[PDB]
Amino acid sequence: KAEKIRVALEKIKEAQVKKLVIRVHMSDDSSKTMMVDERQTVRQVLDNLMDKSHCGYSLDWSLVETVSELQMERIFEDHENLVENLLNWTRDSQNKLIFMERIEKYALFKNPQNYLLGKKETAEMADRNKEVLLEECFCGSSVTVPEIEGVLWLKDDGKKSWKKRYFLLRASGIYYVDLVCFLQLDHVNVYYGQDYRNKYKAPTDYCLVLKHPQIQKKSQYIKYLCCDDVRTLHQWVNGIRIAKYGKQLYMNYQEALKRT
Numbered sequence: 001k002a003e004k005i006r007v008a009l010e011k012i013k014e015a016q017v018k019k020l021v022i023r024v025h026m027s028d029d030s031s032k033t034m035m036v037d038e039r040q041t042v043r044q045v046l047d048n049l050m051d052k053s054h055c056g057y058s059l060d061w062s063l064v065e066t067v068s069e070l071q072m073e074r075i076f077e078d079h080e081n082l083v084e085n086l087l088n089w090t091r092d093s094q095n096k097l098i099f100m101e102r103i104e105k106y107a108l109f110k111n112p113q114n115y116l117l118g119k120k121e122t123a124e125m126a127d128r129n130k131e132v133l134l135e136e137c138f139c140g141s142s143v144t145v146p147e148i149e150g151v152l153w154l155k156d157d158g159k160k161s162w163k164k165r166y167f168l169l170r171a172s173g174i175y176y177v178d179l180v181c182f183l184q185l186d187h188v189n190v191y192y193g194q195d196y197r198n199k200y201k202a203p204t205d206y207c208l209v210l211k212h213p214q215i216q217k218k219s220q221y222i223k224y225l226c227c228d229d230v231r232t233l234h235q236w237v238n239g240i241r242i243a244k245y246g247k248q249l250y251m252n253y254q255e256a257l258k259r260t
Contacts, residue, residue: 013039020083024049024063027100036082043078043255049099050259057260059110062102068094069217071199072191072209075105077245078252088214095216108238109134109253115238118147120231137242138250145171148239153203153226154182160201162226169239174210183223185244189213190237193224202226206233210240 017037025031034052036045042063050061063076065085076085089095108115112133113125125133137144149168156163166177173184193200193207200207203226211222227233241249 020086022082022086022097025096025098027098038081038083040082041078042076042080042082043252045082046078046099047259053099058101059106059256059260060101060103061256062098062100062105064096064098064100064102066096066098067191067216068096070209070211070215070222071194071196073194074189074191075102077241077249078255079245079248085213088216090216093216104234104237106253106256107234108242109250112137115235116146116242118149120150120235122231134250138247143171143242143246145169145243146239148235150232151228152232152236155200155202155224155226157220162201162203167225169236169243171243173243174240183210185240187212188223190240190244192233192237196224196226200224204228206230208233208237208240 014037017039019035019037021033021035023031023033034048036048046061046063049055063082064073065076066073076082086097110130111122111125112130114122116133116137137146147169150166151164152167153162154165155161167182168175168177168179172181174182176182188210189212191209191211193202193209195205196202196207197205202224206227206229208225208227209222210225211219215222225236227236245252
């Protein structure tokens with residue numbers, strides 16, 4: 001049975017699609033060019049990066065965007081179309097695309113007990129049960145978005161000042177105290193703010209930002225939240241990621257686990 005016939009079939013599509021050459025910064029701020037196409041997910045792009053490089057088996061390998069003008073970053077999810085995202089960048093953008101390791105992208109999956117149980121305290125858990133809890137949260141008839149709630153600093157629109165409100169995360173979005181909808185997650189990505197204690201007079205350096213992918217400059221449609229500590233930040237970022245991406249985050253993780 002000649003299955004050789006299927007591989008030359010694959011080379012056809014790798015020849016008829018719009019190619020783009022991007023630039024990719026390394027962990028040490030050296031850079032490299034590479035070819036991508038407009039069909040490629042970040043997953044496929046990472047694989048070519050891992051194939052071409054040394055490289056090294058690790059679950060934490062990521063493509064990271066920096067929104068230079070807004071001093072923030074988000075680590076791309078692996079199902080995302082890279083090109084459609086790179087087209088948000090302005091013509092003169094100083095945004096970078098960093099290829100590096102990153103504890104954060106899959107931390108919730110190797111310790112789901114510290115992210116899915118609505119406790120601020122961290123604990124250990126047997127392998128066996130990590131898998132069950134993971135299976136239980138993502139793989140049912142719907143995703144069980146963990147019950148995240150607590151106080152956060154919200155920055156005033158257009159001002160370098162902050163108010164304190166009580167937030168809670170649901171499936172439909174983030175609500176403040178019964179309830180008022182702060183944001184719905186469908187049209188916003190979530191970013192880690194960089195050095196906001198200085199830039200925005202923030203209470204802490206532990207900031208998360210919510211903005212439409214298309215926004216590249218100062219805008220009041222960008223929401224800034226500041227947590228008291230790092231734990232809270234990771235709890236919120238991770239919960240928003242579960243609430244936004246659902247079962248897809250679980251698939252992305254399994255696919256990454258296959259490459260370790």
